[PDB]
RNA sequence: GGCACCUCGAUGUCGGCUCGUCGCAUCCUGGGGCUGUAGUCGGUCCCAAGGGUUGGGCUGUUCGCCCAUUAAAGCGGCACGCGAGCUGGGUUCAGAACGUCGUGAGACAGUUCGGUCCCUAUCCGUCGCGGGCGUUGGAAAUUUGAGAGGAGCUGUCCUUAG
RNA sequence: GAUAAACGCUGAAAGCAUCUAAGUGUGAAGCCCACCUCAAGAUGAGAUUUCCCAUUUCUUUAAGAAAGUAAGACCCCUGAG
């Protein structure tokens, strides 16, 4: 009958969630956050439409890195100039740019297309307990049982 | 035959103030504070200290001795203190201290100045003798090794800064 | 310490003890502090400096309004100076060449003279091919690279527009300061065409 | 220091230990016997 | 449909895989197209199905 | 060296020039252990690729020998990097000659002199320079720095001190 | 500033010893800065100072279409560093 529901842009209300990264392994935090950004938690999920929620990640500085990842997990980037390979360790990122650490981890877990790049903008990461988004009235997302 | 098991007593009248962590040992020499692991349970009788591990796993057998060694080291420094004695050897190598500042002349084109923090002091009984003194064993030993390290002993004539009584292998060079 | 002036030209001066040294004449009619930036407002500390009075008809209401706080005429060149004592500066204060003293070690910044479209020999100091022996390779930029990438790597240097670049010369010596003439004599040469903007700052390496 | 895949005690005073994940030999008698696996 | 049923199942304290096992135990033949439609359009009915599945899983 | 899998309705072959770029099994410089390390020089192993790493004589040469230097004068990869960028001395097209082989035409198990190097760049790539729109009222200036590029070498003398 | 090799300090596992397991330090022309330049098309499009100031008509609850303009910019012209 071709009656399967399809969400439309603008009809679905996008909620705001706060996730605490404290002592949560980087990847397990990102995996659950990535699903929220995509709308995979809601029955209205529609692959060609953005239906996911907004996520505020607080305390990114206290995200957990198991094993020796703090010193042995290396983030390479190339400037596209010869010999332009640059590297940094995950531990160094956590201390100095913890937004980048969380954003990079979540970026890899989202689709690499227009919609996925759009969904990544709904992520806001803060090192520390406080964020500027009280005007959105975000609600706590408890992820202890989700990781 | 176990450091973690052994009993530590408190000579003279030192008093130890507990907490969730960062135990404190105080006494005539000064005050010390150190942050233990929460897995070694400590008993405090009137004058006897005994630590207690949960199990006999490698991880807990290792740390138990360390806590007892750390806590014991905390005491003997507060109660009697620690020091390192260095006997610099050379035809004209000499030392001298002005306050918390030790200036060495060990053959370099320039003199060497050494600075101590609040918890340590330099005695220098004679200009060929240096004695680090303090309340913490890590700091005293580390500072004592920096003084030795400015000019470590050499094997052909014995010159340099050596620990008093350390064995210094010498080579019968031609 | 810093000031904005214009490059007047080069000459030479005899020092005490008779040595002859080249100097560049920089004329810096007093600069005016137009704005003070602080962490509270801008997130970083700096003073905004104006140099070279400009005719009114050449200015704007937005520009005239900006210099109104300093109570000065429109200024042709406006630049910021960082790492100074902001409290010692305030809007409308004048900065004169006497801030620098003879013997001071300075850094001089300017815009190098334009040279237009130039080949890789002049632009990059590359080597010609031989001029004879059957050569048909004289002023060409050399191989673009190996075969394997199926492309040219970035920073393969070629012909293009030359000059017009910001260049800083470090550790130059202030030889004289003629305050009544608003002139600073700098030993040596500095970038830029005559009449171009020149920025004199106390040497960062000092 | 000897760096070799085969580190073994050379005399009765040599001690085999491990620091930072590497088999090492240390001797208080002969500095020639100092070894690190590699 | 499976992804949408999974989202609705979790909102009822159950994973997709356990729900389909429980519905099978309860002899419910509703297909994934219908379940996904109930998940979106009639959530109360989807909850009633989920409860029957959870009941069947316990038995 | 083996194989014969892409290319024979053609993937241009040595050396050199121009331009480099990468690996590190490091030539120099930096750090270090052991020494049969007195010192000065060294040996050997470890770490280290940031930069640097000469000009001539002979030969088409690569190589190598030599001269004179140098802190050193590293080894390799990139279609033995680079001929729609250059050269064309070498690599036997046609000429000719020598030695040699052949009865011979000819040939090399070899040498010698001489011998046409085409192409107006469409696309990506590279180096420069503009136009458009965006950046959520329209404007004129000043800016932070995500990110990126450049630079990175080293000798000798004096002093400490004969 | 963080490190390599390397050297520790304190220290137990293992009453000893031990640079390590916890704890803590030294350490390279190298790494990250420091120095120079580019740089928000950094669509994540940032910040600061200053200027203009709320017009008319028609449709309309329209982030409407249209018209004079303001600050300002350009066309054009004389030129050059
Ligand atoms: K072929
Ligand atoms: K090469
Ligand atoms: K050596
Ligand atoms: K190098
Ligand atoms: K030659
Ligand atoms: K020749
Ligand atoms: K080829
Ligand atoms: K050619
Ligand atoms: K080609
Ligand atoms: K193409
Ligand atoms: K912008
Ligand atoms: Mg040349
Ligand atoms: Mg020609
Ligand atoms: Mg490619
Ligand atoms: Mg062997
Ligand atoms: Mg076959
Ligand atoms: Mg073809
Ligand atoms: Mg190596
Ligand atoms: Mg080619
Ligand atoms: Mg014959
Ligand atoms: Mg032949
Ligand atoms: Mg001829
Ligand atoms: Zn031995």
mmCIF file of C-alpha atoms (C1' of nucleotides) in Angstrom, chain C residues 3-11 23-29 51-52 77 108-115 165 167 169 172 182-200, chain G residues 81:
data_model
loop_
_atom_site.group_PDB
_atom_site.id
_atom_site.type_symbol
_atom_site.label_atom_id
_atom_site.label_comp_id
_atom_site.label_asym_id
_atom_site.label_seq_id
_atom_site.Cartn_x
_atom_site.Cartn_y
_atom_site.Cartn_z
ATOM 1 C CA UNK C 3 55.680 53.887 15.940
ATOM 2 C CA UNK C 4 54.406 54.238 12.374
ATOM 3 C CA UNK C 5 56.253 56.314 9.797
ATOM 4 C CA UNK C 6 56.838 56.596 6.074
ATOM 5 C CA UNK C 7 59.970 55.545 4.227
ATOM 6 C CA UNK C 8 61.642 58.737 3.009
ATOM 7 C CA UNK C 9 64.814 57.333 1.487
ATOM 8 C CA UNK C 10 68.345 56.167 2.094
ATOM 9 C CA UNK C 11 71.436 58.238 2.808
ATOM 10 C CA UNK C 23 70.861 54.765 7.007
ATOM 11 C CA UNK C 24 67.216 54.750 5.992
ATOM 12 C CA UNK C 25 65.286 57.912 6.819
ATOM 13 C CA UNK C 26 61.863 57.195 8.314
ATOM 14 C CA UNK C 27 59.681 60.244 8.932
ATOM 15 C CA UNK C 28 57.039 59.632 11.611
ATOM 16 C CA UNK C 29 54.829 62.620 12.287
ATOM 17 C CA UNK C 51 49.534 57.991 11.562
ATOM 18 C CA UNK C 52 49.641 60.537 8.720
ATOM 19 C CA UNK C 77 47.300 54.362 8.338
ATOM 20 C CA UNK C 108 61.306 47.165 11.056
ATOM 21 C CA UNK C 109 58.303 45.916 9.077
ATOM 22 C CA UNK C 110 57.153 47.076 5.652
ATOM 23 C CA UNK C 111 55.660 45.932 2.360
ATOM 24 C CA UNK C 112 58.312 44.897 -0.145
ATOM 25 C CA UNK C 113 58.419 46.698 -3.468
ATOM 26 C CA UNK C 114 56.183 45.188 -6.113
ATOM 27 C CA UNK C 115 57.819 43.436 -9.046
ATOM 28 C CA UNK C 165 54.828 41.074 0.757
ATOM 29 C CA UNK C 167 58.665 41.631 5.451
ATOM 30 C CA UNK C 169 63.941 43.016 9.235
ATOM 31 C CA UNK C 172 68.335 46.995 13.255
ATOM 32 C CA UNK C 182 59.954 63.666 13.359
ATOM 33 C CA UNK C 183 62.696 61.588 11.724
ATOM 34 C CA UNK C 184 64.278 58.311 12.821
ATOM 35 C CA UNK C 185 67.518 57.139 11.206
ATOM 36 C CA UNK C 186 67.800 53.353 10.977
ATOM 37 C CA UNK C 187 71.112 51.739 10.117
ATOM 38 C CA UNK C 188 70.918 49.661 6.967
ATOM 39 C CA UNK C 189 68.053 49.234 4.538
ATOM 40 C CA UNK C 190 64.417 48.286 5.097
ATOM 41 C CA UNK C 191 61.617 46.957 2.889
ATOM 42 C CA UNK C 192 59.254 49.072 0.888
ATOM 43 C CA UNK C 193 59.072 51.771 -1.738
ATOM 44 C CA UNK C 194 59.629 55.369 -0.723
ATOM 45 C CA UNK C 195 56.551 56.945 0.930
ATOM 46 C CA UNK C 196 55.258 53.495 1.951
ATOM 47 C CA UNK C 197 54.188 52.673 5.494
ATOM 48 C CA UNK C 198 56.952 51.502 7.831
ATOM 49 C CA UNK C 199 56.444 49.999 11.295
ATOM 50 C CA UNK C 200 59.236 50.369 13.872
ATOM 51 C "C1'" G G 81 55.204 53.638 -5.114
#
